[PDB]
From Swiss-Prot, chains A, B:
Phenotype upon changing residue 248 to E: In strain: Isolate BJ04
Stated role: Cleaves the C-terminus of replicase polyprotein at 11 sites. Recognizes substrates containing the core sequence [ILMVF]-Q-|-[SGACN]. Also able to bind an ADP-ribose-1''-phosphate (ADRP). May cleave host ATP6V1G1 thereby modifying host vacuoles intracellular pH.
Shown chain mapped onto the complete sequence: 3241 to 3541 of 4382
Side Cytoplasmic, residues: 1-301
UniProt protein name: 3C-like proteinase nsp5
Residues annotated as catalytic: 41, 145
Subunit note: Exists as monomer and homodimer. Only the homodimer shows catalytic activity.
Residues annotated as domain Peptidase C30: 1-301
Lineage: Viruses, Riboviria, Orthornavirae, Pisuviricota, Pisoniviricetes
């Protein structure tokens, strides 16, 4: 069988999605327990965004400037505060659907599912990876702000992303659930631009092991290599350096297939140096880097 | 923004997933209202599968040979019948989570989301397309049988696939929710093999329009072509013939981008004849064919 980049089932999260309107600005928020979290820029107008000041904009606001609707049944807000780039809106009702959850900050390379929402209304679910340049390559249209990203850990939903904006290149940027941005982005409309990305070596290797485990084994190779030698190649092809840690993470996968990590590197080096020859690995004409070792293992014994 | 192949939010469907055990065989079933549907081969043993007879195997069965568990809380079955390759197990309890739903038979080329499940326990969600050869290219491991496929139509869940088996090539096969297989497959373990696939022209074209709408416009072209001429190319590259109907479906997309359908065909012909030159459309090194015109439109105005 294998391998599809799947997202987690979005049910536990759909139930925590609500809408938040501040005058003329509408976007999604996350309703957990008695609190609703959302991007602080729901306070701004397209004017405000050309360099806003949120301390200013928010002191001019009361708990009744915010309309919150869990479905049709509106909630009443009874507090508010500003946690970095987020708004914590205390509210009268506790969310019944509130699942076991926590907030984690996700590292670059790691993946999560995104629940695209509009007006508090889940539209679609997909999986992506936090880019090295701290952006995600997503599909977000207007009013998608406040859509969240998450993994699931048994019964417990770990929230790790909330959507704030689109960058000029069409790639997306956001924050963890404490309102700290990923990357050097600020929630102001300036000339900020994505730093230059790099391909996630660790993930590409894990994917190659997903292929091997699935009979697409043609790219294989008798050669080996030292990580120093491979890393010179990586450099020329804008791949992240491989480290001993990356090698260790990949231990279990090389075990179950019996192909040493350094052998797959040898093989990858050739794929990079020699190209692919319109051949396909797992039905792909290019090396996939949005699947982690843990994603592959969970889906391939 | 755009474009990601997203699946629908799997919440409405997670709640209808239950486990079904028949002696030593376990797999997933669909609990809607007072009925639970599941693959009929839950009746068989790896022995039985080398050419089984289900009329036989099922008359030797009673309503208490089937253990059904909605979570922990077990259901009691109080009927049973065989609808083509499916089992309809009447049960004492009606599913509270039962959403507005219906059963549709999906056409080749069209797409849907899959909720991969094991022991009545949703594992991941993804989107795929019904292949021309009537298989889906999925990720299904043992005990995933009974996992269903569906689209959502406002509030109403249209079910269209239920998983039955893996074919020798690692591609998957199943039935609609009336138990009729897609394709010439039977639920017996024989030498049956996937017919030869073909690339879904209509979908590749819709994808190119998704690219255009997103500034990856480099593959464009001043030439045009007649569908006859294009179809000779399609033939040589194992793409489905383009028909006037396909052209019509693509009308809205060519409108909103202003590029005539036959112009994109001209452009595609070149992509096929000249290759891609390691350049990327929407960040892909090969032409994607699992996104329909309707998928693209829903995600790109």
């Amino acid at each position: 069988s294998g391998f599809r980049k799947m997202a987690f089932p979005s049910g536990k999260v759909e139930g925590c999605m609500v809408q938040v309107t501040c005058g003329t600005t509408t976007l999604n928020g996350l309703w957990l327990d008695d609190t609703v979290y959302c991007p602080r820029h729901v306070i701004c107008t397209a004017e405000d965004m050309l360099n806003p000041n949120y301390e200013d904009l928010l002191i001019r606001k009361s708990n009744h400037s915010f309309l919150v609707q869990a479905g049709n049944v509106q909630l009443r807000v009874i507090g508010h505060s500003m946690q970095n780039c987020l708004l914590r809106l205390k509210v009268d009702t506790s969310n019944p659907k509130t699942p076991k959850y926590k907030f984690v900050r996700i590292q670059p390379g790691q993946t999560f599912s995104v629940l695209a929402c509009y007006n508090g209304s889940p539209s679609g679910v997909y999986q992506c990876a936090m880019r090295p340049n701290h952006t995600i390559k997503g599909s977000f249209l207007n009013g998608s702000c406040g859509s969240v990203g998450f993994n699931i850990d048994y019964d417990c939903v770990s929230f790790c992303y909330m959507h704030h904006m689109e960058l000029p290149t069409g790639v997306h940027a956001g924050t963890d659930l404490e309102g700290k941005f990923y990357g050097p982005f600020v929630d102001r409309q300036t000339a900020q631009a994505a730093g230059t990305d790099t391909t996630i070596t660790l993930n590409v290797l894990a994917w190659l092991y997903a292929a091997v485990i699935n009979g697409d084994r043609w790219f294989l190779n008798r050669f080996t290599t030292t990580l120093n030698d491979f890393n010179l190649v990586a450099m020329k092809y804008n791949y992240e350096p491989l480290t001993q840690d990356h090698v260790d993470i990949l231990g279990p996968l090389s075990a179950q297939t019996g192909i040493a990590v350094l052998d797959m590197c040898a093989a990858l080096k050739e794929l990079l140096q020699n190209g692919m020859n319109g051949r396909t690995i797992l039905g792909a004409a290019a090396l996939e880097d949005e699947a982690t070792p843990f994603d592959v293992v969970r889906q391939c014994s």
